[PDB]
């Protein structure tokens, strides 16, 4: 059991908003923080490797790294987009529904619908995509470690381990492609 899998952030709410932020709604928030941190963890990890490949400027097969790294980069970096454009877009509606209706009953529903959209838009509830991209997540952990766990060319069974993932990654890559072929239109457009 890795430590990151259990990490979370709780919030001691004050008295007035005690009615608006129940342990139920404050829990779905936590699930978003668990996932969004993971993608942040792999991205920050992945780019550090790039900070080394460019750094490693002084093998005809070692060049397969960046020809896989960038493939694993674009799928991740742009997956990390649609996030600044599902947060800053759904949030900008949640704040607008507040300053419009003098009623309070709307806030309990506007905020509630705002939360359900994040779980729906960010594909956290959609099981198939969430069980396929998840494989892409831990996939980069293996690759990034492989480049960092040494400083020489991939000869000591690294290349033997390298060609393992590309047969799965590129398979996982086009596997996702058929899945998207309602909400994916905003996402698949960027990759394509």
Partner 1 sequence: EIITLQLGQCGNQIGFEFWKQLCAEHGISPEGIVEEFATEGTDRKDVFFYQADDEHYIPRAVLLDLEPRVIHSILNSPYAKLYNPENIYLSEHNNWASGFSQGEKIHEDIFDIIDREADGSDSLEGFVLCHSIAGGTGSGLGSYLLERLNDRYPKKLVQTYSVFPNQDEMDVVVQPYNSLLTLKRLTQNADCVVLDNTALNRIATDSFSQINQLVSTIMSASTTTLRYPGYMNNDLIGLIASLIFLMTGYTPLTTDQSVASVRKTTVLDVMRRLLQPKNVMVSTNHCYIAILNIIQGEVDPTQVHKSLQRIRERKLANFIPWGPIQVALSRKSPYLPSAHRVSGLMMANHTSISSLFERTCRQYDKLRKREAFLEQFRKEDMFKDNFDEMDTSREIVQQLIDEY
Contact set with partner 1 (CB under 8 A): 47-48, 50-51, 54-55, 67, 70-71, 73-74, 77, 80-85, 87-89, 186, 189-190
- CB closer to partner 1 out of 5 and 51: 51
User: Among candidates 168, 171, 179, 174, which has minimal Cα distance to 128?
Assistant: 179
- CB closer to partner 1 out of 85 and 156: 85
Handedness of CA 157, 159, 163, 166 (dihedral sign): positive
- CB closer to partner 1 out of 19 and 84: 84
Minimum CB separation of residue 44 from partner 1 in Å reads 8
CB-based contact 21:13 (threshold 8 Å): yes
Residues 6+ apart with CB under 8 A from 166: 64, 68
Minimum CB separation of residue 14 from partner 1 in Å reads 23
- CB closer to partner 1 out of 71 and 132: 71
Minimum CB separation of residue 91 from partner 1 in Å reads 12
Minimum CB separation of residue 63 from partner 1 in Å reads 10
SS3 for 57? coil
- Using left for φ > 0, alpha for ψ between -120 and 50, and beta otherwise, residue 8 falls in beta
CA within 13 Å, CB half, 105: 0
């Amino acid at each position: 059991a890795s430590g990151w899998a259990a990490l979370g952030l709780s919030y001691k709410v004050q008295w007035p908003l005690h009615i608006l932020f129940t342990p139920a709604v404050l829990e779905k928030y936590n699930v978003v923080f668990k996932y969004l941190l993971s993608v942040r963890r792999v991205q920050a990890e992945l780019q550090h490797c790039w900070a080394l490949q460019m750094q490693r400027k002084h093998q005809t097969d070692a060049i397969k790294w960046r020809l896989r790294n960038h493939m694993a980069f674009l799928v991740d970096n742009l997956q990390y987009y649609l996030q600044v454009d599902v947060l800053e877009s759904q949030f900008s509606q949640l704040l607008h529904q507040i300053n419009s209706t003098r009623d309070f009953e709307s806030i309990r529903l506007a905020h509630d619908h705002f939360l359900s959209n994040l779980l729906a838009q960010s594909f956290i509830l959609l099981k198939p995509v969430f069980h396929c991209l998840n494989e892409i997540l831990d996939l980069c952990h293996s690759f990034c470690s492989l480049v960092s766990q040494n400083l020489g060319p991939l000869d000591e069974r690294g290349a033997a381990q390298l060609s393992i993932l590309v047969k799965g990654f590129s398979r996982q890559s086009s596997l996702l492609f058929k899945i998207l072929s309602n909400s994916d239109l905003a996402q698949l457009l960027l990759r394509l």
